[PDB]
Amino acid sequence: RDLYRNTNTFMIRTPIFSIDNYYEFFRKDGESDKIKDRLLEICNNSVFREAILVSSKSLYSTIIDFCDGKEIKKFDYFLQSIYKYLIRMSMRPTPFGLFSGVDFGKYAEETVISYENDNFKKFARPDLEWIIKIVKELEDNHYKNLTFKINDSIFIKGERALLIHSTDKEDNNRIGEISIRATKPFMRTYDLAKDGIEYNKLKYILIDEYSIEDESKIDNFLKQLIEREFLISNLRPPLTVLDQFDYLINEVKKAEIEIPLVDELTEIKEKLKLYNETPVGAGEETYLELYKKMESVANVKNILQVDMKLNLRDKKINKKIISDVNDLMNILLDLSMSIENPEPFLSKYKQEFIEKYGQDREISLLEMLDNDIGIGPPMNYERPRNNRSLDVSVNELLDNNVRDYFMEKYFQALKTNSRNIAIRDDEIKNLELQKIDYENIPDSLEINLLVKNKSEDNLSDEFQYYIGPNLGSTSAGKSFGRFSHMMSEPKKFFEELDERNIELIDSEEYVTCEISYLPSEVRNANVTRNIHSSEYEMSLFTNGSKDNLYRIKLNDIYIGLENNTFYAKSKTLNKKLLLTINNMLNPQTAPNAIRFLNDISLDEKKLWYKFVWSDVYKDFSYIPAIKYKNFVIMPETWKMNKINMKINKKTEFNEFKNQFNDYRIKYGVPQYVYITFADNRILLNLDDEQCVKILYHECKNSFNEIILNSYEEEGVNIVKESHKDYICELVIPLTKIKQEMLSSDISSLSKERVKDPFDEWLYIKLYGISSNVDDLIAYYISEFCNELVEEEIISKYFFMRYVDPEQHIRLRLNSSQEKLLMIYPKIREWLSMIRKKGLMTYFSIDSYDREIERYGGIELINIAEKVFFFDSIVTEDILRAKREGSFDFCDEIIGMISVVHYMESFGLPYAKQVEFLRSQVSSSEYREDFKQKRTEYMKLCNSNKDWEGLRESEEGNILIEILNKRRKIIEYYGNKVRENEEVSTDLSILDSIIHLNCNRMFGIDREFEKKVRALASHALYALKHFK
Amino acid sequence: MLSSDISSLSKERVKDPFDEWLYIKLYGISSNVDDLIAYYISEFCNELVEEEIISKYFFMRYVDPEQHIRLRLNSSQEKLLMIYPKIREWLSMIRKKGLMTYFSIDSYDREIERYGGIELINIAEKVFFFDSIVTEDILR
Amino acid sequence: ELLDNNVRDYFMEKYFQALKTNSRNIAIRDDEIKNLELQKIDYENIPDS
Amino acid sequence: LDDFDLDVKVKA
Secondary structure, three states: OOOEEEOOOEEEEEEOOOOHHHHHHOOOOOOOOOOOOHHHHHHOOHHHHHHHHHHOHHHHHHHHHHHOOOOOOOOOHHHHHHHHHHHHHHHOOOOOOOOEEEEEEEEEOOOEEEEOOOOOEEEEEEOHHHHHHHHHHHHHHOHHHOEEEEOOOOEEEOOEEEEOOOOOOEOOEOOOEEEEEOOHHHHHHHHHOOOOEEHHHHHHHHHHHHOOOOHHHHHHHHHHHHHOOOEEEOOOOOOOOOOHHHHHHHHHHHHOOOHHHHHHHHHHHHHHHHHOOOOOOOOHHHHHHHHHHHHHHOOOOOOEEEEEEOOEEEEEEEOOHHHHHHHHHHHHHHHHHHEOOOOHHHHHHHHHHHHHHOOOOOEEHHHHOOOOOOOOOOOOOOOOOOOOOOOOOOOOOEOHHHHHHHHHHHHHHHHHOOOEEEOOHHHHHOOOOOOOOOOOOOOEEEEEEEEEEOOOOOOOOOEEEEEOOOOOEOOOOOOOHHHOOOOOOHHHHHHHHHHHHHHOOOOOOEEEEEEEEOOOOHHHHHHOOOOOOOOEEEEEOOOOOOOHHHEOOHHHEEEEEOOOOEEEEEOOOOEEEEEEOOOOOOHHHOOHHHHHHHHHOOOOOOOOOOOOOOOOOOOOOEEOEEEEOOEEEEOOEEEOOOOOOOOOOOOOOOOHHHHHHHHHHHHOOOOEEEEOOOOEEEEOOOHHHHHHHHHHHHHOOOOOOOEEEEOOOOOEEOEEEOOEEEOOEEEEEEEEOOOOOOOOOOOOOOOOOEEOOOOOEEEEEEEOOHHHHHHHHHHHHHHHHHHHHHHOOOOEEEEEEEEEOEEEEEEEEEOOHHHHHHHHHHHHHHHHHHHHOOOOOEEEEOOEEOOOHHHOOOOOHHHHHHHHHHHHHHHHHHHHHHHHOOOOOOHHHHHHHHHHHHHHHHOOOHHHHHHHHHOOOOOOOOOOOHHHHHHHHHHHOOOOOOOOOOOOOHHHHHHHHHHHHHHHHHHHHHHHHHHOOOOOOOHHHHHHHHHHHHHHHHOOOHHHHHHHHHHHHHHHHHHHHHO | OOOOOOOOOOOOOEEOOOOOEEEEEEEOOOOOOOOHHHHHHHHHHHHHHHHOOOOEEEEEEEEEOEEEEEEEEEOOHHHHHHHHHHHHHHHHHHHHOOOOOEEEEOOEEOOOHHHOOOOOHHHHHHHHHHHHHHHHHHHO | OOOOHHHHHHHHHHHHHHHHOOOOOOOOOHHHHHOOOOOOOOOOOOOOO | OOOOOOOOEEEO
16 A cells, blocks of 8 residues: 655756766767867866856866966866866756756656756855845944844753854854853843844833943943844844845845945845846856955855756656655565664663653753753764763664575675665565554655666656665655745745645644754855745744744743653643754754754654665675665665775875776776765776876775765666756655644742752662561561651651662651751661661662652642552561561462552442553463462452452451551542542552552562563453452 | 771771761752852851861762762761751752752762771871862862 | 774675685685784783693 | 843853
């Protein structure tokens, strides 16, 4: 069955030259060989000259000098650069500058793609660095005329206010945190400028409210706030508008500042429009005039950004291509189930979150990621690193059968001298892998494909697909975002994507939100300009396109765990957020907050281009192509190391050449390969190409990503201009087909939650008790603590067993601070006496962190702490009686009786008990044979009358009399729990108290508790006859 | 020095909480150290020393997974129990400003053999006191 | 156990070239081990017997 | 310190 459906359109990419210009230049279509001539015959090409001008001006000047016949200094670096750019313009589809272009097609019944006469329109727009330089200058000089607003990434921690990063730089290093003292005037400003305020309106209000008496004090205060970007002006353009330059012009006109600049900007706008009308190759003179004019306003390294559009005549493809992608995705998602732990760092972070905050709380995003007041970021995050000494070892737990399956394939391929590895559906089905759930399939994806017609002998749509080097993306619309200004109507595309995303999720609880942020290196933001159709927006360090009604803030997001998967929520909206980022920004370079928000949008979803074999074959220096029907998922790859290529940094050419031919003959490297960073396609039977390769190899440590890939050397291309072939790449966006108490307001350091030592609670941890726990609890703790309770020095106590690396006992005493400090001298004597007998080693006094939300809130936990007290008394009595020999029941029988007694007294009716115990899966089959003692269990676990089946003997009578001390308090607690209306699913509390009781009686043992629950469920199920 | 006869649980080696030593660990102080030490710990502890409630103190920085400050105060058990209520107020005031999160009271395990035996450890613990004072002054 | 990467590459290349030529053995040599540039062993780490 | 003093602290 098909999992994915196509959208309304796709993208086409094609370089500016045909592949004929590549073979003609490397003396393939002509046998003549010569360094110059061809170099002069290309450097005088108009299209080549302009394409170089738009990208590298220095090389353009050097080309002009060379054409003038002047003395070129190097002439080696010159030749290498010219060769690399010519190869890129002929053979690399990826769009950049005037080297390559983009267009948008449609699906149909037949494939026809053709070129029009008027190709290659230009789309020139000012760079972001230029605009930001102008904006900063304006707001530095004319701040008095501007309107300012508060930054959305601000975080107030105690008496300091912080930002996640800074757009500026410290000397020559980035700024990872700026903190200022959050004084009273700062808070007043933080309230006034919440949604925008004029400079004078704020300044005079502050002067009125403080009287300062020195105006230069307020001016410096506000200027210091503005310089550090705590206040954002209205001149700064959004990244999610369709035109940043027009927005800036309108804003400066509104402010009425720097009149000379306003007319100059309009002149630049007018000139910039003319350049967009010239054909490619004819705009050299206009570009220079425009560049000279623009550089006079603000001189920066990057001034103009240029893109071009193919403008094809026909752009249809056969809709059969969507079936093949579905087959590929079926097999790729089937294999994904062989890896058990695909995200180890996030899986560890979930455990840290659960250990710290439990599962019934929602924690602020910025507090959670803080090193001091949180748990820090995951252990692989590079922006502020976790300063804790945790273990970073990780293991993805690949299945052994699949690992063996992929090694036989490699061995067979080597033995038979085959160049490819073919995987098949029937072979994968024999591995008996687990099935994937509809909840783990990603909602949308994109895939990059190079399509080549299999053969011209039949004139038929037999297509051969090669997955592109980048493999696509994890969401539909990420690749299309950058080109929003070139689409005919971009809104309809993103509106459809948003509608489909909403269709796939439960409504009335979710909203869509777009994350936009302006990095420190504003050069990286040129790819972040894009449109979106999400309902809300969060813009950091820039203005937003939305009204203040649809504005989100970083200090408003709250994180939680539901079904063991993270989610984000907005406190003000009370809606969960469905976060989107419609651009190819690399998360790993972003701050921790942005990177974390990106991660949890893919939480528990399989990543389709994380291949299983990548870990099996990582140690090999040769890997054959991996194929599936008519897909080449991976190309054939060779890589060089110090063993097979002994190259020194001082190695001379003509010795590398002779050493490299041995490599070619030994490993069978074909004639055409890709050098897979930036130099790409290379013809190895050409001296200049090997010169390129030695220059690249020597610099790149001789191992640093020197990976050769085979060329797509079968089939023919599908895009033709008259009779010239063009290399074409498709980007196919797909969407999934649809198949049918946390509101607590207690802060983390509230006096209700954390109790300091002797703050009404004395919390003691006893170490070194492993071998004598039962005797200690039964005889020593019991007597001393009960004597304290009777004397009225403490009101109650309870204990439990835990493990922080080492095993210990946690004992908590409740009384006033004065009494707790009064009896401590006697507690020391007691513990010294206990130690002298070898029953313990040492102890500590710790802070008590109460689990308010886990036990029903602030009003009900005070009763859970009495339930714990009576349960501790009962545990002591049972252990003492068991050691004295009063009864001889096994551990399992005691556990079962205790669980049944808890459920019966809490008020859970029999109709629910078997469902309740089965809810943890334990009751399925696991201990059906172990219940071979059916009769004894059925007699003991029946609670009819007054446990009549248990009171038949003195042992059972004693056991049931010990337990009844615990009944009235549990009944009271259950009544109060079910009386509350804010508390839902009281079955969560019952499970917690049962877990605690089992821990007290038997310690840390998961398997034993599972067994006890399973046996209890089976025993209760068999008694269905007696109700 | 390996011939030491002091047992592992000897009263000379392991000191229980308030057993002539009050040993406190402060958590959540990563970002504001050199201000906590320079201004807050210094003024409170030196004031205690001048009033003769404690005879000496010293501190160090460590990491048990999480980073913290270890602060050790020396006095008799009676004075340590009498002055503790004021220490809680001090630490609450420090927390309210966001300088720390929470603390614990632990057992002091002395390194007798590392600093020359049972007669010289008592002088190493004064070397530590004066070095802590000098560190505070330099940071300030 | 932190095995060196050069030695891992050395043995993987040996195995590959053994499979390709259909040979039944892998031969290690003193001069080949010399070029790996390994650390020298101390007299205090050599087993006594 | 006065209310208008912002003790700027920067990490780099």
